[PDB]
Amino acid sequence: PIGKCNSECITPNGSIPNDKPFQNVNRITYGACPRYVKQSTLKLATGMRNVPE
Amino acid sequence: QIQLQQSGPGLVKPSQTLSLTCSISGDTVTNNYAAWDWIRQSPTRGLEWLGRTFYRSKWYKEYALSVKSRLTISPDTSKNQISLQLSSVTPEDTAVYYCARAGITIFGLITGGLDYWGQGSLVTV
Amino acid sequence: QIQLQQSGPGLVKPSQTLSLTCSISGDTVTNNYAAWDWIRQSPTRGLEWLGRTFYRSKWYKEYALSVKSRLTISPDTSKNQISLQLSSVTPEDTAVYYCARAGITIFGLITGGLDYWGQGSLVTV
Amino acid sequence: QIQLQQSGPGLVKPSQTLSLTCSISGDTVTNNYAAWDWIRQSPTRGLEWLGRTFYRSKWYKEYALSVKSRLTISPDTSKNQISLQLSSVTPEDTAVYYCARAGITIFGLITGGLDYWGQGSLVTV
Amino acid sequence: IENGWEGMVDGWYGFRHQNSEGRGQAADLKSTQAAIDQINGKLNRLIGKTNEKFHQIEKEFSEVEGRIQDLEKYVEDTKIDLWSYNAELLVALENQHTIDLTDSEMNKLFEKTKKQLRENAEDMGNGCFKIYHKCDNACIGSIRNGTYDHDVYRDEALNNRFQI
Amino acid sequence: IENGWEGMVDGWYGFRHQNSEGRGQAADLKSTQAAIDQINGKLNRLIGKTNEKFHQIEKEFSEVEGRIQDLEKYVEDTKIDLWSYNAELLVALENQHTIDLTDSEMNKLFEKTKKQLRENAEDMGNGCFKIYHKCDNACIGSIRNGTYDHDVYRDEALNNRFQI
Amino acid sequence: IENGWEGMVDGWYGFRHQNSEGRGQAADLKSTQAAIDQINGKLNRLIGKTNEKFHQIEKEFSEVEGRIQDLEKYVEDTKIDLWSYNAELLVALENQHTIDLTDSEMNKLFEKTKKQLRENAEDMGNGCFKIYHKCDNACIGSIRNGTYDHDVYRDEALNNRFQI
Amino acid sequence: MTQSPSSLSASVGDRVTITCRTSQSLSSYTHWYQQKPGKAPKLLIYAASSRGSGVPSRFSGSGSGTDFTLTISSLQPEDFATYYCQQSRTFGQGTKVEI
Amino acid sequence: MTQSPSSLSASVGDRVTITCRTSQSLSSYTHWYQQKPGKAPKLLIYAASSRGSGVPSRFSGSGSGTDFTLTISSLQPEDFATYYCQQSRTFGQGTKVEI
Amino acid sequence: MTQSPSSLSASVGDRVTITCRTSQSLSSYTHWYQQKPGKAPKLLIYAASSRGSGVPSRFSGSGSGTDFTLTISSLQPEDFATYYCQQSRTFGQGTKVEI
Amino acid sequence: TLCLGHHAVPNGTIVKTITNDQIEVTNATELVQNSSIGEICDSPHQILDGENCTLIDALLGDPQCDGFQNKKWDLFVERSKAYSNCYP
Ligand SMILES: *[C@@H]1O[C@H](CO)[C@@H](O[C@@H]2O[C@H](CO)[C@@H](O[C@@H]3O[C@H](CO[C@H]4O[C@H](CO)[C@@H](O)[C@H](O)[C@@H]4O)[C@@H](O)[C@H](O[C@H]4O[C@H](CO)[C@@H](O)[C@H](O)[C@@H]4O)[C@@H]3O)[C@H](O)[C@H]2NC(C)=O)[C@H](O)[C@H]1NC(C)=O
Ligand SMILES: *[C@@H]1O[C@H](CO)[C@@H](O[C@@H]2O[C@H](CO)[C@@H](O[C@@H]3O[C@H](CO[C@H]4O[C@H](CO)[C@@H](O)[C@H](O)[C@@H]4O)[C@@H](O)[C@H](O[C@H]4O[C@H](CO)[C@@H](O)[C@H](O)[C@@H]4O)[C@@H]3O)[C@H](O)[C@H]2NC(C)=O)[C@H](O)[C@H]1NC(C)=O
Ligand SMILES: *[C@@H]1O[C@H](CO)[C@@H](O[C@@H]2O[C@H](CO)[C@@H](O[C@@H]3O[C@H](CO[C@H]4O[C@H](CO)[C@@H](O)[C@H](O)[C@@H]4O)[C@@H](O)[C@H](O[C@H]4O[C@H](CO)[C@@H](O)[C@H](O)[C@@H]4O)[C@@H]3O)[C@H](O)[C@H]2NC(C)=O)[C@H](O)[C@H]1NC(C)=O
Ligand SMILES: *[C@@H]1O[C@H](CO)[C@@H](O[C@@H]2O[C@H](CO)[C@@H](O[C@@H]3O[C@H](CO)[C@@H](O)[C@H](O)[C@@H]3O)[C@H](O)[C@H]2NC(C)=O)[C@H](O)[C@H]1NC(C)=O
Ligand SMILES: *[C@@H]1O[C@H](CO)[C@@H](O)[C@H](O)[C@H]1NC(C)=O
Ligand SMILES: *[C@@H]1O[C@H](CO)[C@@H](O)[C@H](O)[C@H]1NC(C)=O
Ligand SMILES: *[C@@H]1O[C@H](CO)[C@@H](O)[C@H](O)[C@H]1NC(C)=O
Ligand SMILES: *[C@@H]1O[C@H](CO)[C@@H](O)[C@H](O)[C@H]1NC(C)=O
Ligand SMILES: *[C@@H]1O[C@H](CO)[C@@H](O)[C@H](O)[C@H]1NC(C)=O
């Protein structure tokens, strides 16, 4: 359906935010959109190698 | 919606104990990415830090240098409160006390910023 | 196919020397990624290590801590022979001796695993 | 097109001062990636190093170990001149002096190669 | 350092001193800040650095066709698989460097305390500095901000180390 | 360490001690194992991690055609050259890290022996710690497994250093 | 080392000694050469390692067409964007390593002087080794080429440290 | 914890820079606080770079070494309050701005 | 070099776990050996993770720090032999399994 | 700074190798110089691997550890001059080649 | 006495690096967007809705698509229920 936002990326599943550099929602994009990838989760390490206790 | 209402009497005998209960509504004390500090403010010295009590698998405690041997902070999970206990009060402590929530974190580290404050006064003889 | 047949007498006088010939067929002693250990097995102590030899541009030798000053291993290239020489034998050494090939390597490092064993007994007065 | 013509008298009294003017045409003294050495050559020892000067926001000077306390190099910006001043001359210094330009640099580092030399003789009583 | 501390939340690097007056825990604030800037710098290159494309070829089809439809399904599949590998290589390379710089900053702070206490403290092998000398909590904090002076504790600690 | 040893086959690191009882050689087993797991972990991501493709475009042609055949020869050539560069960058990056972590492990083992011998030994420059103290082969092996105690050899070695 | 020297052109690492005879500055030539070979090796893989392509598809068009022209504009745009990211990742990776190897080389030269001055000098924090021992300019240069002997300056400097 | 201003009377719509000079040079820990008289304070900008919830767009901060500046694009009659600067556990003496 | 079992009588087709607790924590050096009485021993699994030549699929090993377990999926009448555990140069006292 | 030849008489078109032993092992700093009698010396090859301006293609250099060789492919009648070897600040004793 | 330590978490996440595959990190951030709002919004771009009309039908002047006359768009959206009621 048609709604209102403030966002550049448009995908057939609906508009998505373009802050993250990668997406896997759909391969069809329009406007400023993140690049399509096949992986679902790509964790970026922002901390230290964790040891318990 | 985070709301903090702190209770406790504001008239105590000098050289005695002190009671201050900080009831918490809308948020739980058992929060991994959060801490709960205690800040007092006076017209003379101003805002200063007292201590904090966060939760990493059990209740940890921290205190300032000056009131290290006189302040105990007792958390409680039963009805979502945090209790402040001050021992051996002094009439230089005639000031207001604020119960405020820390935990505006970046990368999981508590940066010491305070949000969702409260209100409460205190004066002694 | 790798085949190891070790020979040598199994009846020697105590407080004397000892000879043990480990004939090798199907493989050569001069191998970069293979060493040749020597393992004895007793009914009381069990399996234990004695020493090893190989060839990295020169005939290297290693020995155990206990039989450091009594064991010499002499390799031979002429007819594919590795010879074990034990000096000053003792009647506590009444045990079987195994000539086995090491060198089941990963990343070029000999990990100490043994393959292609043999058979041989020994008893002294 | 870099041309270096050095002037200066070649007959001075021993145990006195010395003057040597190295005029520069086609290039400027103020250059980031270029230094200016001073090399003397004698039939006895041969080519040897004396000192250098350049400009990295301030006129810097370096000198050799032997003539550390007797050599001063004075650059000039006004008319494209670098002047050599030798103090307390000795009759062992009867040799020719070359004013040559360094600065054949790789990755911004002056490797000590010399280009665009000059000509000049010197003899003392 | 065998293991870290569960309840340290105000920094990634810090000290837990213990003397006759008790034991206290304080967080180092300089080395923790330097690790944040190196981590936030990596996120600055990735977040909000997208490129815009308006008109492309059709990437999904309904009616089966011949050679041209097979070529469009192969060009789109080539771009997706190449960018999927590029995303895997970029994250794995950045995660390798982020952990390495974080572990190196831990060792750098360990050297700074040892360098400051050149003649008054040595390594105990457990990431600690056993000091029985007259060093109170303010003396411990002098090491933290780099204002510790070893000259006033040189002769006072050399004789005590031979005694103990 | 100026150069390696030709006759060490059971480990990438080790010690060649020499005292009055003779000279022996025993390879390190802990640091060698830790280097293997980092190398074997790198091979785990590459070996057996392929992707399957069933139907593609024709990549070889017999009869010359116009625009469509030139496009198919350009799409296939673009994918091959891009993956050839990706293979070069992946191997060269992993080879750079593998050598760097291996060269860092031999320094950590050098530091661990110096840290354990806190007051009884000092560095000489070539890696050979010239020790004349009463430290036999079992004493040498006590350093290897981390069970060496410097307290029983503190006063026995400090006077020997001033004597020699 | 807080900051470098503005008046050093013949090397990347060096010393500025100062004693009773004056102060001098000499550039180190061994560690600077090793940094050049690691930098020049990186430029060897990039300079003059191009690949040749003779016949390609048309990459610019005048008259608008249907599906085939849209496919050719998408294949060419895919190759350009992928190679633009590959150029960004290649330069940023080598720039990260070039700085990281260089700062390690600065610390390695700092350790070599401390390792050579095993019992006659200690660290200060700023890198300026305060030495009052009888060590002249030729003594300073003996450290530079690795010919310095600490045995002739062991007893002469140990008593000076207790005196000063 | 030192602050250059203590009390000022700026006109409505003026631009004011409040400098909070600290001792330790770190930027991701310091914050800024505003307290109107008679109620609890609040948080305007945290980590000296990003504004908090319920903050208008006229509040901006900068980070340069050990000196941190809090800048107001346009002063308002509803912005009469004391301003406090906190680094990690120590609060400033205060900054009283007035219309 | 300690092994928890010394002698056991398991039924045919049973699953048995033999624990070889060691002193030094390293996994790529330890192996496992089987020796029938009156014959030369052989190598079943090397580096505690990969079986050797001439080994059926019912033999599996595990590595967890300093703990190494050799597991048999199904006991066989032809598998009556003494089991030995070696880390780098020291062999275990033995493990006698019986049908 | 030592040079293996001192004075040689090679024929026209001969190949001559001049080896200059050094003390410190570094290649990017050393150079090579040629001085005709009564003429200003010039630079032929710098950093022991790349020729300079105004240099023919018959001059080549090599670097192997602390050993540096300056090789002339074909001797010429116009190449009668004394050769000098310099590493960073010390020049060689000289190398007089003759046709 | 002047010991050193570091922050730890009871429950961290797992990232992938060059050497290891299951290394444990205290804090990790998601980098791949796998969620959508659910509706196509038209504030930056002029979006023209289909309303069971395709582009070819609106181009030729389909009487059921008479609303798309002299119209311009930044992105045309074609519905999956588009049908043509005119001459074949
Ligand atoms: C790495 O570090 C970052 C920063 O520390 C973490 O991000 C935080 O993650 C936690 C939990 O993972 C978040 O806390 C929860 O957020 C939920 C939704 O967040 C929105 O609302 C908050 C305000 O509450 C905003 O700040 C935020 O930007 C979002 O807009 C809340 O719904 C949760 O509420 C909890 O408590 C209430 C109390 O009644 C319960 O009713 C709820 O059910 C719930 O239990 C909770 O507050 C936090 O918001 C995140 N912060 C930020 C800035 O994003 C990462 O998660 C961390 N990564 C890893 C892997 O650990
Ligand atoms: C890095 O390290 C690895 C492992 O350490 C090396 O891999 C070994 O490489 C060597 C030679 O490079 C191999 O040795 C030779 O293997 C040949 C074929 O191997 C098969 O057979 C062996 C059993 O013999 C199996 O283990 C293996 O998996 C293969 O199935 C043999 O034919 C060779 O026999 C030699 O001796 C006989 C004796 O009669 C001669 O007749 C032959 O002509 C020949 O000389 C020899 O054994 C070894 O098998 C490899 N091991 C493994 C596990 O693969 C890498 O080579 C090394 N890389 C580098 C660059 O050094
Ligand atoms: C990293 O380090 C390298 C090497 O040190 C630098 O490369 C040098 O860069 C400088 C300037 O950035 C160059 O100097 C100028 O070169 C101009 C043209 O160069 C040609 O001519 C020289 C000979 O003069 C050749 O060696 C060179 O190969 C080129 O063929 C000259 O025209 C300049 O002349 C200046 O002085 C005259 C004096 O009259 C003035 O009239 C001019 O206007 C001008 O001011 C000047 O010499 C130098 O040539 C470069 N060397 C090399 C080997 O390339 C990099 O610049 C440096 N990178 C960074 C970012 O700093
Ligand atoms: C966004 O929309 C697109 C298209 O409408 C979705 O792609 C398609 O989604 C359907 C159903 O989710 C997929 O059908 C099923 O796929 C599974 C495999 O995932 C298969 O096993 C089933 O038999 C069935 O075919 C369809 O494959 C998929 N097409 C493509 C090209 O991916 C997409 O899922 C939507 N995304 C979100 C987040 O809603
Ligand atoms: C450093 O910390 C100590 C701890 O008490 C304190 O006494 C000292 O004043 C501090 N120095 C500075 C410059 O802040
Ligand atoms: C460490 O090795 C020495 C070497 O002989 C030995 O005596 C000691 O028992 C070993 N310690 C342990 C815990 O194995
Ligand atoms: C090292 O440098 C010193 C400095 O004077 C010098 O005396 C000594 O001869 C040099 N040694 C060598 C081997 O060049
Ligand atoms: C945290 O980790 C422990 C592992 O000890 C696990 O049992 C628990 O379920 C985990 N909790 C969460 C919330 O992931
Ligand atoms: C097509 O869309 C129009 C506009 O909303 C609507 O009136 C009409 O009913 C739709 N057609 C069908 C078959 O529903």
Q: Can you give the residue ranges of every domain in chain G? A: 13-163
K29 interfaces chain E, CB cutoff of 8 Å? yes
CATH number at residue J26: 2.60.40.10
CA distance G13 to G24: 14
CA distance A23 to chain K (A): 4
**Non-local CB neighbours of K29 within 8 Å, separated by 6+ positions:** A43, A44, A46, E43
Helices (H), chain G: 30-46, 67-116, 137-144, 155-163
Q: How far is CA C49 from CA C23, C71, D17, F23, I31, in A?
A: 20, 12, 84, 20, 14
Which ligand has an atom closest to residue G148 CA? 7
Q: Is I38 helix (H, G, I), strand (E, B) or coil?
A: coil
Distance CA H62, CA K51 (A): 51
CA distance A28 to A13: 10
Q: Tally C-beta pairs within 8 A across B and K.
A: 9
> Is the Cβ–Cβ distance between G13 and G36 less than 8 Å?
no
Domain hosting D31: range is 3-124
Output the six-digit token pair for A13. 């599943």
- Could you give the CA distance from residue J42 to residue C29 in angstroms, rounded to a whole number? 61
Token couple for D115: 């280009």
* Number of domains making up chain C: 1
Contact I98, I9 (CB under 8 A): yes
Protein residue whose Cα sits closest to atom 48 of ligand 2: C33
- The CA-CA-CA angle for residues B60, B62, B64, to 5°, reads 175
H81 is in which domain, residue-wise? 2-97
Which chain E residues touch A30 with a CB distance below 8 Å?
Answer: 53-54
Structure solved via: cryo-EM
CA A26 – ligand 4 centroid, Å: 9
Q: For residue B57, give the CATH number of its domain.
A: 2.60.40.10
Inter-residue contact D112 to D1 (CB < 8 Å): no
Residues K5 and E5 sit within 8 Å (Cβ to Cβ): yes
Rounded to whole angstroms, the Cα distance separating E152 from E135 reads: 11
The nearest CA of chain G is from the CA of D13 a distance in Å of 30
For residue G9, the distance in angstroms to the closest alpha carbon of chain F comes to 30
Resolution in angstroms, to 1 decimal, for this deposition? 3.4
DSSP E strands in chain C: the ranges are: 3-7, 11-12, 18-25, 36-42, 46-55, 59-63, 71-76, 81-86, 96-102, 114-115, 123-124
Nearest residue by C-alpha to atom 40 in ligand 2: C27
- Reading the block at residue E24, the tokens are 């206290």
Chain F residues close to G83, C-beta within 8 Å: 82
Q: How many domains does chain J have?
A: 1
Cβ atoms within 10 Å of B62's Cβ, excluding its own: 21
Cα K31 → chain centroid: 15
Exposed e or buried b per residue across I43-79, where buried means at least 16 C-beta atoms within 10 angstroms of its C-beta: bbbbbbeebbeebeeebebebeeeebbbebeebeeeb
CB I98 within 8 A of CB I8: yes
Q: How far apart are CA I34 and CA I51, in angstroms?
A: 13
- What burial class does residue H64 get, using C-beta atoms within 10 Å of its C-beta: 0-12 exposed, 13-18 middle, 19+ buried? exposed
Q: Classify domain F13-163 by CATH number.
A: 3.90.20.10
Report the SS3 class of residue E90. helix
Which of K35, K40, K77 has the highest number of chain A CBs within 10 A, making it the mutation to test binding with A? Answer: K40
Burial G3-15 (b: 16+ CB within 10 A, else e): eeeeebbbbbbbb
Closest CA to G10 of D124, D112, F26, H81: D112
Contact, I73 vs I56, CB < 8 A? no
> Is J87 exposed, middle or buried, given 0-12, 13-18 or 19+ CB atoms closer than 10 A?
buried
User: After which residues does chain K become discontinuous at a C–N distance over 2.5 Å?
Assistant: none
How many CB atoms neighbour CB F89 within 10 A? 15
Atom of ligand 3 nearest to the CA of D28: 38
Chains touching J (at least 3 CB pairs under 8 A) are: D, G
Cβ(G11) – ligand 7 distance below 6 Å: no
